[PDB]
Structure formats: C-alpha cells, structure tokens
Amino acid sequence: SYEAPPATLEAIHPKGLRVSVPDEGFSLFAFHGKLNEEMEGLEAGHWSRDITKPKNGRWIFRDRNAALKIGDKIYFWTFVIKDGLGYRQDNGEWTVEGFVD
Numbered sequence: 001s002y003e004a005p006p007a008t009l010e011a012i013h014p015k016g017l018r019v020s021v022p023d024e025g026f027s028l029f030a031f032h033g034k035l036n037e038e039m040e041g042l043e044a045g046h047w048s049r050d051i052t053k054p055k056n057g058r059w060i061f062r063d064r065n066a067a068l069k070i071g072d073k074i075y076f077w078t079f080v081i082k083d084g085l086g087y088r089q090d091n092g093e094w095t096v097e098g099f100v101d
C-alpha cells in the first residue's frame with residue numbers, strides 16, 4: 001500500500017535550503033528538520049512548517065536564509081496527507097555535498 005515519496009533537498013548558493021516532494025494527490029506537506037542534530041522521533045524540529053498547496057507539480061518548503069556548508073547533515077521527517085490519511089518519510093538524513101545556483 002501507499003508510502004510517502006522521498007524528499008529532495010538542495011543547498012542553495014549563496015544561501016538557502018529547498019526541500020520538495022512530487023504532488024501525489026496530497027492536501028498537505030509538512031517538513032520537520034534539524035541541522036547537525038538528530039531527530040528524537042517525531043519532534044517538531046528547528047524547521048517545522050505546513051505547506052498547503054503545490055506549485056508546478058511539487059510541494060516545496062524553503063528557508064531562504066539557511067547558510068549551509070559542505071558536510072552539514074539535515075535529519076528530518078516529512079508528513080503528507082493523502083485522501084484524509086497521513087504518511088511520513090521517517091528517519092530522513094541528508095548531507096550537503098554541493099550547492100545549486
């Protein structure tokens with residue numbers, strides 16, 4: 001049965017974090033994440049935000065001010081509502097390996 005799609009994360013040059021999932025017929029996408037500190041289960045995170053509509057096919061979370069560095073780790077989990085039911089990407093871990101213009 002259904003599983004949340006994996007998120008794509010990008011570090012932006014000169015600054016910023018962008019996180020997105022494809023719209024698979026959701027009503028809601030939430031991102032919950034911490035920088036260089038593990039998530040202790042389903043805690044809110046330093047980044048914690050509900051996104052309520054997709055934009056051109058994707059659900060997008062942005063922190064335009066996040067100044068990331070190579071080797072920074074983001075520990076995260078996401079939440080999507082599909083047909084009134086909730087699904088998570090659990091135990092997300094992403095390492096900055098480069099930047100996007």
Ligand SMILES: OC[C@H]1O[C@@H](O[C@@H]2[C@@H](O)[C@H](O[C@@H]3[C@@H](O)[C@H](O[C@@H]4[C@@H](O)[C@H](O[C@@H]5[C@@H](O)[C@H](O[C@@H]6[C@@H](O)[C@H](O)O[C@H](CO)[C@H]6O)O[C@H](CO)[C@H]5O)O[C@H](CO)[C@H]4O)O[C@H](CO)[C@H]3O)O[C@H](CO)[C@H]2O)[C@H](O)[C@@H](O)[C@@H]1O
Binds near residue numbers: 028030042079086088
């Ligand atoms: O009303 C004024 C008040 O408003 C507040 O804002 C609200 C805001 O917080 C809310 O945001 C949504 C957010 O809560 C939601 O998070 C969910 C989270 O609820 C969920 O937690 C689960 C528990 O549900 C679960 O409970 C179990 C229960 O299901 C079962 O029936 O019984 C069990 C007992 O036997 C019981 O434990 O327990 C587990 C732990 O085991 C919890 O993890 O977890 C999911 C993740 O899986 C999490 O996503 O997510 C939504 C979508 O992102 C958020 O939108 O939204 C409301 C509006 O819809 C707001 O009103 C303010 O903060 C206050 O200041 C205001 O006073």
